[PDB]
Design a binder for this molecule. Structure first.
Ligand SMILES: [Mg+2]
Ligand SMILES: [Mg+2]
Ligand SMILES: [Mg+2]
Ligand SMILES: [Mg+2]
Ligand SMILES: [Mg+2]
Ligand SMILES: [Mg+2]
Ligand SMILES: [Mg+2]
Ligand SMILES: [Mg+2]
Ligand SMILES: [Mg+2]
Ligand SMILES: [Mg+2]
Ligand SMILES: [Mg+2]
Ligand SMILES: [Mg+2]
Ligand SMILES: [Mg+2]
Ligand SMILES: [Mg+2]
Ligand SMILES: [Mg+2]
Ligand SMILES: [Mg+2]
Ligand SMILES: [Mg+2]
Ligand SMILES: [Mg+2]
Ligand SMILES: [Mg+2]
Ligand SMILES: [Mg+2]
Ligand SMILES: [Mg+2]
Ligand SMILES: [Mg+2]
Ligand SMILES: [Mg+2]
Ligand SMILES: [Mg+2]
Ligand SMILES: [Mg+2]
Ligand SMILES: [Mg+2]
Ligand SMILES: [Mg+2]
Ligand SMILES: [Mg+2]
Ligand SMILES: [Mg+2]
Ligand SMILES: [Mg+2]
Ligand SMILES: [Mg+2]
Ligand SMILES: [Mg+2]
Ligand SMILES: [Mg+2]
Ligand SMILES: [Mg+2]
Ligand SMILES: [Mg+2]
Ligand SMILES: [Mg+2]
Ligand SMILES: [Mg+2]
Ligand SMILES: [Mg+2]
Ligand SMILES: [Mg+2]
Ligand SMILES: [Mg+2]
Ligand SMILES: [Mg+2]
Ligand SMILES: [Mg+2]
Ligand SMILES: [Mg+2]
Ligand SMILES: [Mg+2]
Ligand SMILES: [Mg+2]
Ligand SMILES: [Mg+2]
Ligand SMILES: [Mg+2]
Ligand SMILES: [Mg+2]
Ligand SMILES: [Mg+2]
Ligand SMILES: [Mg+2]
Ligand SMILES: [Mg+2]
Ligand SMILES: [Mg+2]
Ligand SMILES: [Mg+2]
Ligand SMILES: [Mg+2]
Ligand SMILES: [Mg+2]
Ligand SMILES: [Mg+2]
Ligand SMILES: [Mg+2]
Ligand SMILES: [Mg+2]
Ligand SMILES: [Mg+2]
Ligand SMILES: [Mg+2]
Ligand SMILES: [Mg+2]
Ligand SMILES: [Mg+2]
Ligand SMILES: [Mg+2]
Ligand SMILES: [Mg+2]
Ligand SMILES: [Mg+2]
Ligand SMILES: [Mg+2]
Ligand SMILES: [Mg+2]
Ligand SMILES: [Mg+2]
Ligand SMILES: [Mg+2]
Ligand SMILES: [Mg+2]
Ligand SMILES: [Mg+2]
Ligand SMILES: [Mg+2]
Ligand SMILES: [Mg+2]
Ligand SMILES: [Mg+2]
Ligand SMILES: [Mg+2]
Ligand SMILES: [Mg+2]
Ligand SMILES: [Mg+2]
Ligand SMILES: [Mg+2]
Ligand SMILES: [Mg+2]
Ligand SMILES: [Mg+2]
Ligand SMILES: [Mg+2]
Ligand SMILES: [Mg+2]
Ligand SMILES: [Mg+2]
Ligand SMILES: [Mg+2]
Ligand SMILES: [Mg+2]
Ligand SMILES: [Mg+2]
Ligand SMILES: [Mg+2]
Ligand SMILES: [Mg+2]
Ligand SMILES: [Mg+2]
Ligand SMILES: [Mg+2]
Ligand SMILES: [Mg+2]
Ligand SMILES: [Mg+2]
Ligand SMILES: [Mg+2]
Ligand SMILES: [Mg+2]
Ligand SMILES: [Mg+2]
Ligand SMILES: [Mg+2]
Ligand SMILES: [Mg+2]
Ligand SMILES: [Mg+2]
Ligand SMILES: [Mg+2]
Ligand SMILES: [Mg+2]
Ligand SMILES: [Mg+2]
Ligand SMILES: [Mg+2]
Ligand SMILES: [Mg+2]
Ligand SMILES: [Mg+2]
Ligand SMILES: [Mg+2]
Ligand SMILES: [Mg+2]
Ligand SMILES: [Mg+2]
Ligand SMILES: [Mg+2]
Ligand SMILES: [Mg+2]
Ligand SMILES: [Mg+2]
Ligand SMILES: [Mg+2]
Ligand SMILES: [Mg+2]
Ligand SMILES: [Mg+2]
Ligand SMILES: [Mg+2]
Ligand SMILES: [Mg+2]
Ligand SMILES: [Mg+2]
Ligand SMILES: [Mg+2]
Ligand SMILES: [Mg+2]
Ligand SMILES: [Mg+2]
Ligand SMILES: [Mg+2]
Ligand SMILES: [Mg+2]
Ligand SMILES: [Mg+2]
Ligand SMILES: [Mg+2]
Ligand SMILES: [Mg+2]
Ligand SMILES: [Mg+2]
Ligand SMILES: [Mg+2]
Ligand SMILES: [Mg+2]
Ligand SMILES: [Mg+2]
Ligand SMILES: [Mg+2]
Ligand SMILES: [Mg+2]
Ligand SMILES: [Mg+2]
Ligand SMILES: [Mg+2]
Ligand SMILES: [Mg+2]
Ligand SMILES: [Mg+2]
Ligand SMILES: [Mg+2]
Ligand SMILES: [Mg+2]
Ligand SMILES: [Mg+2]
Ligand SMILES: [Mg+2]
Ligand SMILES: [Mg+2]
Ligand SMILES: [Mg+2]
Ligand SMILES: [Mg+2]
Ligand SMILES: [Mg+2]
Ligand SMILES: [Mg+2]
Ligand SMILES: [Mg+2]
Ligand SMILES: [Mg+2]
Ligand SMILES: [Mg+2]
Ligand SMILES: [Mg+2]
Ligand SMILES: [Mg+2]
Ligand SMILES: [Mg+2]
Ligand SMILES: [Mg+2]
Ligand SMILES: [Mg+2]
Ligand SMILES: [Mg+2]
Ligand SMILES: [Mg+2]
Ligand SMILES: [Mg+2]
Ligand SMILES: [Mg+2]
Ligand SMILES: [Mg+2]
Ligand SMILES: [Mg+2]
Ligand SMILES: [Mg+2]
Ligand SMILES: [Mg+2]
Ligand SMILES: [Mg+2]
Ligand SMILES: [Mg+2]
Ligand SMILES: [Mg+2]
Ligand SMILES: [Mg+2]
Ligand SMILES: [Mg+2]
Ligand SMILES: [Mg+2]
Ligand SMILES: [Mg+2]
Ligand SMILES: [Mg+2]
Ligand SMILES: [Mg+2]
Ligand SMILES: [Mg+2]
Ligand SMILES: [Mg+2]
Ligand SMILES: [Mg+2]
Ligand SMILES: [Mg+2]
Ligand SMILES: [Mg+2]
Ligand SMILES: [Mg+2]
Ligand SMILES: [Mg+2]
Ligand SMILES: [Mg+2]
Ligand SMILES: [Mg+2]
Ligand SMILES: [Mg+2]
Ligand SMILES: [Mg+2]
Ligand SMILES: [Mg+2]
Ligand SMILES: [Mg+2]
Ligand SMILES: [Mg+2]
Ligand SMILES: [Mg+2]
Ligand SMILES: [Mg+2]
Ligand SMILES: [Mg+2]
Ligand SMILES: [Mg+2]
Ligand SMILES: [Mg+2]
Ligand SMILES: [Mg+2]
Ligand SMILES: [Mg+2]
Ligand SMILES: [Mg+2]
Ligand SMILES: [Mg+2]
Ligand SMILES: [Mg+2]
Ligand SMILES: [Mg+2]
Ligand SMILES: [Mg+2]
Ligand SMILES: [Mg+2]
Ligand SMILES: [Mg+2]
Ligand SMILES: [Mg+2]
Ligand SMILES: [Mg+2]
Ligand SMILES: [Mg+2]
Ligand SMILES: [Mg+2]
Ligand SMILES: [Mg+2]
Ligand SMILES: [Mg+2]
Ligand SMILES: [Mg+2]
Ligand SMILES: [Mg+2]
Ligand SMILES: [Mg+2]
Ligand SMILES: [Mg+2]
Ligand SMILES: [Mg+2]
Ligand SMILES: [Mg+2]
Ligand SMILES: [Mg+2]
Ligand SMILES: [Mg+2]
Ligand SMILES: [Mg+2]
Ligand SMILES: [Mg+2]
Ligand SMILES: [Mg+2]
Ligand SMILES: [Mg+2]
Ligand SMILES: [Mg+2]
Ligand SMILES: [Mg+2]
Ligand SMILES: [Mg+2]
Ligand SMILES: [Mg+2]
Ligand SMILES: [Mg+2]
Ligand SMILES: [Mg+2]
Ligand SMILES: [Mg+2]
Ligand SMILES: [Mg+2]
Ligand SMILES: [Mg+2]
Ligand SMILES: [Mg+2]
Ligand SMILES: [Mg+2]
Ligand SMILES: [Mg+2]
Ligand SMILES: [Mg+2]
Ligand SMILES: [Mg+2]
Ligand SMILES: [Mg+2]
Ligand SMILES: [Mg+2]
Ligand SMILES: [Mg+2]
Ligand SMILES: [Mg+2]
Ligand SMILES: [Mg+2]
Ligand SMILES: [Mg+2]
Ligand SMILES: [Mg+2]
Ligand SMILES: [Mg+2]
Ligand SMILES: [Mg+2]
Ligand SMILES: [Mg+2]
Ligand SMILES: [Mg+2]
Ligand SMILES: [Mg+2]
Ligand SMILES: [Mg+2]
Ligand SMILES: [Mg+2]
Ligand SMILES: [Mg+2]
Ligand SMILES: [Mg+2]
Ligand SMILES: [Mg+2]
Ligand SMILES: [Mg+2]
Ligand SMILES: [Mg+2]
Ligand SMILES: [Mg+2]
Ligand SMILES: [Mg+2]
Ligand SMILES: [Mg+2]
Ligand SMILES: [Mg+2]
Ligand SMILES: [Mg+2]
Ligand SMILES: [Mg+2]
Ligand SMILES: [Mg+2]
Ligand SMILES: [Mg+2]
Ligand SMILES: [Mg+2]
Ligand SMILES: [Mg+2]
Ligand SMILES: [Mg+2]
Ligand SMILES: [Mg+2]
Ligand SMILES: [Mg+2]
Ligand SMILES: [Mg+2]
Ligand SMILES: [Mg+2]
Ligand SMILES: [Mg+2]
Ligand SMILES: [Mg+2]
Ligand SMILES: [Mg+2]
Ligand SMILES: [Mg+2]
Ligand SMILES: [Mg+2]
Ligand SMILES: [Mg+2]
Ligand SMILES: [Mg+2]
Ligand SMILES: [Mg+2]
Ligand SMILES: [Zn+2]
Lengths: 118, 131, 12, 59, 204, 122
RNA sequence: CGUGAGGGAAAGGUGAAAAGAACCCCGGGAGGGGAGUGAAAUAGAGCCUGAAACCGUGGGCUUACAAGCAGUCACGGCCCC
RNA sequence: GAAUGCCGGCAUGAGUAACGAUAAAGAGGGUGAGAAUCCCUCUCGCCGUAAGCCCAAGGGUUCCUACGCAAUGGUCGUCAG
RNA sequence: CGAUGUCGGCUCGUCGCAUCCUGGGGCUGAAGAAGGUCCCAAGGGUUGGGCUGUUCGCCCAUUAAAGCGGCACGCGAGCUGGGUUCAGAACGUCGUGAGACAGUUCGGUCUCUAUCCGCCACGGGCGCAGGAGGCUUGAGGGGGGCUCUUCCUAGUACGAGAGGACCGGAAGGGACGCACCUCUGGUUUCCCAGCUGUCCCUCCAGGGGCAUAAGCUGGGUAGCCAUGUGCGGAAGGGAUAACCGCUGAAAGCAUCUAAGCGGGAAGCCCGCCCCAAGAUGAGGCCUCCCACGGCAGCCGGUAAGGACCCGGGAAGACCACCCGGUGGAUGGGCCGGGGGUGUAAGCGCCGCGAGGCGUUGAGCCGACCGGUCCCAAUCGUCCGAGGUCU
């Protein structure tokens, strides 16, 4: 059973899942909007939201924290200097997921977009 | 409805507010009300607290002592009504939250591993200065 | 109880 | 195991009775309030790119 | 008989006479009677109780009608207590005083598809000495040509839980009427937040 | 939580050092013995010229267990070993001293003589 | 197929005549729909005839309280001539 | 009409088992009728006395480039021995 | 014999009763207690170990007891493979020999996919003469059914003594069952920390990957759990068995019986718990819609309601069930609490340095309890009565 358990497994072992999220985060913070499968998208929100919230702290500790997942100094600069300021007054919810209408040809996967909020 | 607050409301009548704070590594004397037929009395259990498992009114703490050549561990509820009082006898400095590891240590080895917590000792003596 | 088997075991 | 196997050929009747559940359910579709095109609900319209009133997407 | 509807809220222990007593807290009150079953009309005796207030924006017309004939704000849950006919038109936890024994009914936790070991406490197979992919299997399920079939009721894997369970003769440890609380000693079926029924016990 | 095959320290001066439980005397089929229960044991280890000798089948009451025991007041107690005191068929010690602390549960179960003889009762 | 000696298949038919379908239309193509050829195109090249098992579309009668080597005899209902 | 007959064709099991090492993936940009699968970039993971490199057997054009996707490829394919 | 796999074990039972225990009896060479022997009784129960491949048996420690049989000597498309039917090898023995032996010895390939019936679970369909949303009766099924020790009665009755009750009452257990997670105790694949090697970012500091599908180590929430906790067996009514009677003829006596009436089991029926109207014999109650347009039938639009879609869920393989969908707290963020870890980074100070001290119970922080419309459950579509005849 699964009673009151949080977190998708996404058919990956532990270290693969973590990398999955980190890489999606890098991609999202880089392009502002990506397309993935619906489950991946839904699960990305919180992972990235936390990273943005930390950038809203701005302090060194928060920078070094965010650097544990994002790993790219330029990216984190963009995160702190350009991205985070948009959300100074936003209380959470820095990302949205909206479902596309077409499934992938080769495997029928239902697709969604994930984007940073205005 | 707030199921959590309801439980807290039930618990509140039994909650204790009068015991000293202690940590794992501290050396403590628990004075415990005990029934021996047909009379009840206070028996003192004194040792190192190796564990404090928190759960609000339901937190409990485990105390370890060597008695006449045998190791004894006692588990007390932090809000038990059968606790008359608790005396801090010494403050020790753990570097981790559960001290099960001392079960395999000699009295000498333990003493080296749980140095006196000079900070909180001073703090104790720092209060204890009352108007 | 112990009686002789009437079949062998197997092969390919 | 000892390799189970069908005992008798399945009849045309029986094989088809198994399939009394195999029919596809047609896609559930609603009009997009912008361009009136038919599309699945709760998805961004693939024709004009609008969802919840706004343009979201380059189609 | 007497009974009430309620939700299981959670567990603790309290202290009583220098004893720790495990309790389940039940939010039981208050339950408006919304229909009475009578022998002239229905062929038996009971009270239909309502429980928990509902957004009237969710209550359809046939239901709205039902409530209205009883003059009762719309309620989320409707459930009967048999052979119980309270004087008032509202049943509260006060029908129980500490010391009474009650029977509690709930919906047990659901284990979904349960293997034969979890469900029926079968022994399963050995874990070494040659055991071949049968460690949690049930073994034989029959004989041979006589009877050449498997009994109805043969304990087997399948769904387990999420089913009506009544555990009986639980001590009422306290009741806190200002908050509609019942404290029952021991364990009650189902999850926190689950709907339960508390009836006066049938044991003597 | 003592069961057949379990070794116990013997906490008296009967001469036995170590016994191995071969039955828990508590009904048709008890799985475990706890503090206060009588077991039947084989003397697996003794010291020269005691009352008891290696090989003897004796009775003993468990006075300490490594599995913690729970108490109606919500507390528990747990010892570093499993120990027992060797008794006669009238439940009296066959020794004259008992060593180490013992569980207070013994008193309530009528092993009064042993409780008194013990240096501490916890 | 076999190291080798050696073993060893399957596979015929448009039409009298290529007159083997210009051109247009849907399609990436395959395929088709018109146009055209022919006495004939379900002779269109996956080509004479084109059986049977097997698969499918449409219609008539029938079937969700019933017991079977599936038929047979009787009667009744419905549909067709 | 039967020879576990012979040759062929087509069924059933069944939309079932499986799709061949649990080293592992994600996104953006191209191309195209069509892209999880082709090209490019970034991020991630795996081998490294090898899962890299060079000889000899054996294989025999499989090499390079252009144009293709019916079949071969255990899916897809615009890619390919 | 174009194959019905063969001992024993394991697993899972189910039945019989010639009954091992527990219940009820009669006789006893039955004082009491404890036995013997027969009768009624199949509801439940019937332990762990040493030896042997063993079934069996002996033995150890217990027990109320440690029952005996059937089900292809129950069960290898459930497992095992110790025994026994292959090929190797040796011993004793027999045979000139090759070889052989109800004589022995060591070794020796046990087959992923269930069509049908049957079984365990779960749906889809149609029906239950109007269509709907609820709440229910319970025909009929299933589950359960065990037992011991101590104390009081009372050291009384009985007995020379030892010993020691009936009836009645109270407490404490063992095994089993159902549920539960407050406590105890597990797990907790990334919740926190410490550690090594190496490669890397960015030199220091601080970090990341890899060392498993957690590198290793110490801890560890919720959940799922037992070793932990609650609760169950009944009570009670009724009809009986063996057995004991009351009244009572045939048969002036006698007789439990031929008329009639009593008492009497752990067993039988009810009672408890769970399923249940496909109970086609398709039940009942409360509420809602309503009398639509076109030729017991057809078509068209609706009603009450329902479904689709979506956010989810201690519900779940899919399905179903349940909750919610902006008139909203459903999930995700965010905030507060809980909880885990156990005092982050940075800076200052002390030390040559490894380090240490302070800032500081700090920093980090899954699920648990809540708040908050910041993000997403946008917008919608489709089906759905007009009530047959006595
Ligand atoms: Mg699992
Ligand atoms: Mg959850
Ligand atoms: Mg999950
Ligand atoms: Mg995760
Ligand atoms: Mg999921
Ligand atoms: Mg997988
Ligand atoms: Mg998987
Ligand atoms: Mg994957
Ligand atoms: Mg990891
Ligand atoms: Mg790893
Ligand atoms: Mg994660
Ligand atoms: Mg761009
Ligand atoms: Mg979070
Ligand atoms: Mg989608
Ligand atoms: Mg879709
Ligand atoms: Mg699609
Ligand atoms: Mg594909
Ligand atoms: Mg709580
Ligand atoms: Mg409150
Ligand atoms: Mg508190
Ligand atoms: Mg510390
Ligand atoms: Mg020393
Ligand atoms: Mg100080
Ligand atoms: Mg196998
Ligand atoms: Mg078949
Ligand atoms: Mg057939
Ligand atoms: Mg056939
Ligand atoms: Mg079939
Ligand atoms: Mg057909
Ligand atoms: Mg079929
Ligand atoms: Mg729109
Ligand atoms: Mg009634
Ligand atoms: Mg009634
Ligand atoms: Mg009544
Ligand atoms: Mg499992
Ligand atoms: Mg399990
Ligand atoms: Mg179970
Ligand atoms: Mg078990
Ligand atoms: Mg077992
Ligand atoms: Mg096991
Ligand atoms: Mg086993
Ligand atoms: Mg094997
Ligand atoms: Mg295995
Ligand atoms: Mg049969
Ligand atoms: Mg059944
Ligand atoms: Mg079953
Ligand atoms: Mg269920
Ligand atoms: Mg009930
Ligand atoms: Mg009770
Ligand atoms: Mg009771
Ligand atoms: Mg109280
Ligand atoms: Mg209910
Ligand atoms: Mg000792
Ligand atoms: Mg010896
Ligand atoms: Mg002896
Ligand atoms: Mg060849
Ligand atoms: Mg060749
Ligand atoms: Mg031909
Ligand atoms: Mg010709
Ligand atoms: Mg064209
Ligand atoms: Mg192309
Ligand atoms: Mg063409
Ligand atoms: Mg053409
Ligand atoms: Mg002609
Ligand atoms: Mg023509
Ligand atoms: Mg044509
Ligand atoms: Mg023709
Ligand atoms: Mg022709
Ligand atoms: Mg011809
Ligand atoms: Mg033809
Ligand atoms: Mg043809
Ligand atoms: Mg044909
Ligand atoms: Mg078809
Ligand atoms: Mg047809
Ligand atoms: Mg019938
Ligand atoms: Mg019919
Ligand atoms: Mg029929
Ligand atoms: Mg027949
Ligand atoms: Mg007939
Ligand atoms: Mg013939
Ligand atoms: Mg054949
Ligand atoms: Mg054949
Ligand atoms: Mg032949
Ligand atoms: Mg033939
Ligand atoms: Mg053939
Ligand atoms: Mg086929
Ligand atoms: Mg399928
Ligand atoms: Mg199948
Ligand atoms: Mg399958
Ligand atoms: Mg394969
Ligand atoms: Mg598969
Ligand atoms: Mg492969
Ligand atoms: Mg693979
Ligand atoms: Mg894989
Ligand atoms: Mg993969
Ligand atoms: Mg993926
Ligand atoms: Mg692209
Ligand atoms: Mg171009
Ligand atoms: Mg293009
Ligand atoms: Mg592709
Ligand atoms: Mg493609
Ligand atoms: Mg791509
Ligand atoms: Mg791939
Ligand atoms: Mg990148
Ligand atoms: Mg190297
Ligand atoms: Mg190497
Ligand atoms: Mg060459
Ligand atoms: Mg070649
Ligand atoms: Mg070539
Ligand atoms: Mg060139
Ligand atoms: Mg191709
Ligand atoms: Mg292709
Ligand atoms: Mg193609
Ligand atoms: Mg081809
Ligand atoms: Mg070509
Ligand atoms: Mg292909
Ligand atoms: Mg292949
Ligand atoms: Mg192309
Ligand atoms: Mg190319
Ligand atoms: Mg090439
Ligand atoms: Mg034969
Ligand atoms: Mg055969
Ligand atoms: Mg056969
Ligand atoms: Mg065995
Ligand atoms: Mg076994
Ligand atoms: Mg076993
Ligand atoms: Mg049977
Ligand atoms: Mg039996
Ligand atoms: Mg019989
Ligand atoms: Mg019978
Ligand atoms: Mg009999
Ligand atoms: Mg007999
Ligand atoms: Mg006899
Ligand atoms: Mg008896
Ligand atoms: Mg008896
Ligand atoms: Mg008797
Ligand atoms: Mg006598
Ligand atoms: Mg007697
Ligand atoms: Mg006598
Ligand atoms: Mg006799
Ligand atoms: Mg007798
Ligand atoms: Mg006899
Ligand atoms: Mg019986
Ligand atoms: Mg039996
Ligand atoms: Mg045994
Ligand atoms: Mg045995
Ligand atoms: Mg041995
Ligand atoms: Mg044995
Ligand atoms: Mg042996
Ligand atoms: Mg044996
Ligand atoms: Mg024997
Ligand atoms: Mg007896
Ligand atoms: Mg035995
Ligand atoms: Mg038997
Ligand atoms: Mg049997
Ligand atoms: Mg036999
Ligand atoms: Mg047998
Ligand atoms: Mg057998
Ligand atoms: Mg068999
Ligand atoms: Mg086998
Ligand atoms: Mg066998
Ligand atoms: Mg078999
Ligand atoms: Mg078979
Ligand atoms: Mg099995
Ligand atoms: Mg063998
Ligand atoms: Mg052997
Ligand atoms: Mg044999
Ligand atoms: Mg032989
Ligand atoms: Mg040999
Ligand atoms: Mg000779
Ligand atoms: Mg000779
Ligand atoms: Mg001779
Ligand atoms: Mg011979
Ligand atoms: Mg021979
Ligand atoms: Mg033999
Ligand atoms: Mg022989
Ligand atoms: Mg012999
Ligand atoms: Mg042998
Ligand atoms: Mg042999
Ligand atoms: Mg060997
Ligand atoms: Mg096998
Ligand atoms: Mg075979
Ligand atoms: Mg296999
Ligand atoms: Mg299969
Ligand atoms: Mg089947
Ligand atoms: Mg069949
Ligand atoms: Mg159904
Ligand atoms: Mg109706
Ligand atoms: Mg209904
Ligand atoms: Mg009734
Ligand atoms: Mg009934
Ligand atoms: Mg029936
Ligand atoms: Mg039954
Ligand atoms: Mg039963
Ligand atoms: Mg009892
Ligand atoms: Mg007395
Ligand atoms: Mg006397
Ligand atoms: Mg006396
Ligand atoms: Mg007295
Ligand atoms: Mg008396
Ligand atoms: Mg006398
Ligand atoms: Mg006496
Ligand atoms: Mg009594
Ligand atoms: Mg009891
Ligand atoms: Mg908890
Ligand atoms: Mg716990
Ligand atoms: Mg714990
Ligand atoms: Mg632990
Ligand atoms: Mg984390
Ligand atoms: Mg490192
Ligand atoms: Mg460094
Ligand atoms: Mg570092
Ligand atoms: Mg990490
Ligand atoms: Mg690396
Ligand atoms: Mg690693
Ligand atoms: Mg590596
Ligand atoms: Mg790896
Ligand atoms: Mg670990
Ligand atoms: Mg790590
Ligand atoms: Mg824990
Ligand atoms: Mg936990
Ligand atoms: Mg949780
Ligand atoms: Mg347990
Ligand atoms: Mg009990
Ligand atoms: Mg009775
Ligand atoms: Mg009665
Ligand atoms: Mg009676
Ligand atoms: Mg008389
Ligand atoms: Mg007379
Ligand atoms: Mg007379
Ligand atoms: Mg009579
Ligand atoms: Mg007569
Ligand atoms: Mg009578
Ligand atoms: Mg009884
Ligand atoms: Mg029901
Ligand atoms: Mg009905
Ligand atoms: Mg019903
Ligand atoms: Mg019937
Ligand atoms: Mg009817
Ligand atoms: Mg009805
Ligand atoms: Mg009724
Ligand atoms: Mg109602
Ligand atoms: Mg109208
Ligand atoms: Mg009108
Ligand atoms: Mg009309
Ligand atoms: Mg008209
Ligand atoms: Mg409507
Ligand atoms: Mg569930
Ligand atoms: Mg779901
Ligand atoms: Mg669905
Ligand atoms: Mg809804
Ligand atoms: Mg809506
Ligand atoms: Mg919104
Ligand atoms: Mg929420
Ligand atoms: Mg929230
Ligand atoms: Mg929180
Ligand atoms: Mg804390
Ligand atoms: Mg510090
Ligand atoms: Mg610091
Ligand atoms: Mg210095
Ligand atoms: Mg310095
Ligand atoms: Mg401070
Ligand atoms: Mg903080
Ligand atoms: Mg927090
Ligand atoms: Mg709270
Ligand atoms: Mg929350
Ligand atoms: Mg909003
Ligand atoms: Mg609000
Ligand atoms: Mg309509
Ligand atoms: Mg008339
Ligand atoms: Zn549109």
């Amino acid at each position: 059973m699964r009673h009151l358990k949080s977190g998708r497994k996404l058919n990956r072992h532990s270290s693969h899942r973590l990398a999955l999220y980190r890489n999606q985060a890098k991609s999202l913070l880089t392009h502002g909007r990506i397309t993935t499968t619906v489950p991946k998208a839904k699960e990305l929100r919180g992972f990235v939201d936390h990273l943005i919230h930390l950038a809203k702290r701005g302090d060194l500790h928060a920078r070094r924290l965010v650097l544990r997942d994002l790993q790219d100094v330029k990216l984190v600069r963009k995160l702190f200097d350009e991205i985070a300021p948009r959300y100074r007054d936003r209380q959470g919810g820095y990302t949205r997921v909206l479902k596309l209408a077409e499934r992938r040809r080769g495997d029928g996967a239902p697709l969604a977009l994930v984007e940073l909020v205005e | 409805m707030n199921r959590g607050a309801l439980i807290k409301l039930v618990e509140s009548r039994y909650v204790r507010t009068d015991l000293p704070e202690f940590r794992p590594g501290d050396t403590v004397r628990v004075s415990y009300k005990v029934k021996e037929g047909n009379r009840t009395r206070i028996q003192d259990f004194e040792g190192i607290v190796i564990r404090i498992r928190r759960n609000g009114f339901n937190t409990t703490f485990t105390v370890r002592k060597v008695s006449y050549g045998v190791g004894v561990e006692r588990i007390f509820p932090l809000h038990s009504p059968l606790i008359q009082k608790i005396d801090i006898v010494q403050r020790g400095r753990a570097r981790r939250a559960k001290l099960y590891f001392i079960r395999n240590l000699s009295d000498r080895e333990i003493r080296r591993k749980l140095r006196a917590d000079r900070k909180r000792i001073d703090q104790d003596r720092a209060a204890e200065r009352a108007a | 109880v112990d009686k002789p088997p009437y079949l062998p075991r197997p092969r390919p | 195991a000892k390799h189970p196997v069908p005992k008798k050929k399945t009849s045309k009747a029986r094989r088809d009775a198994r399939r009394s559940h195999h029919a596809l359910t047609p896609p559930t579709l609603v009009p997009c309030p912008e361009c009136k095109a038919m599309k699945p609900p709760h998805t961004v319209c693939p024709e004009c790119g609008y969802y919840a009133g706004r343009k979201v997407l380059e189609v | 008989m007497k009974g009430i509807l309620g939700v299981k809220v959670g567990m603790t222990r309290i202290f009583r006479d220098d004893r720790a007593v495990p309790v389940t807290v039940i939010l039981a009150g208050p339950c408006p009677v919304v229909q009475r079953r009578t022998p002239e009309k229905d062929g038996y005796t009971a009270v239909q109780l309502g429980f928990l207030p509902q957004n009237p924006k969710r209550v359809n017309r046939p239901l709205k009608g039902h409530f209205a004939k009883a003059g009762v704000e719309p309620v989320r849950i409707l459930r009967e207590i048999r052979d119980f006919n309270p004087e008032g038109d509202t049943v509260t936890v006060e029908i129980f005083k500490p010391g009474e024994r009650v029977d509690v009914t709930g919906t047990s936790k659901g284990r979904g598809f349960a293997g034969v070991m979890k469900r029926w406490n079968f022994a399963g197979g050995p874990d070494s000495h040659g055991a071949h992919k049968i460690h949690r299997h049930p073994g034989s399920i029959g004989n041979r040509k006589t009877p050449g079939r498997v009994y109805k009721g043969k304990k087997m894997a399948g769904h387990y839980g999420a089913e009506r369970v009544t555990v009986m003769n639980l001590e009422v440890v306290d009741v806190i009427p200002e908050e509609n609380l019942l404290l029952v000693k021991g364990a009650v079926p189902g999850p926190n937040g689950g709907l339960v029924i508390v009836r006066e016990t049938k044991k003597a | 939580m003592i069961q057949p095959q379990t070794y116990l320290e013997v906490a008296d001066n009967t001469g036995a050092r170590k016994i191995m439980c071969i039955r828990v005397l508590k009904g048709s089929n008890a799985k475990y013995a706890t503090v206060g229960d009588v077991i039947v044991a084989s003397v697996k280890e003794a010291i020269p010229r005691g009352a008891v000798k290696e090989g003897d089948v004796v009775k003993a009451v468990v006075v300490r267990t490594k599995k913690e025991i729970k108490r109606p007041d919500g507390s528990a107690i747990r010892f570093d070993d499993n120990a027992a005191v060797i008794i006669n068929n009238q439940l009296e010690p066959r020794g004259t001293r008992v060593f180490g602390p013992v569980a207070r549960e013994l008193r309530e179960k009528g092993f009064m003589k042993i409780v008194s003889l013990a240096p501490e009762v916890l």
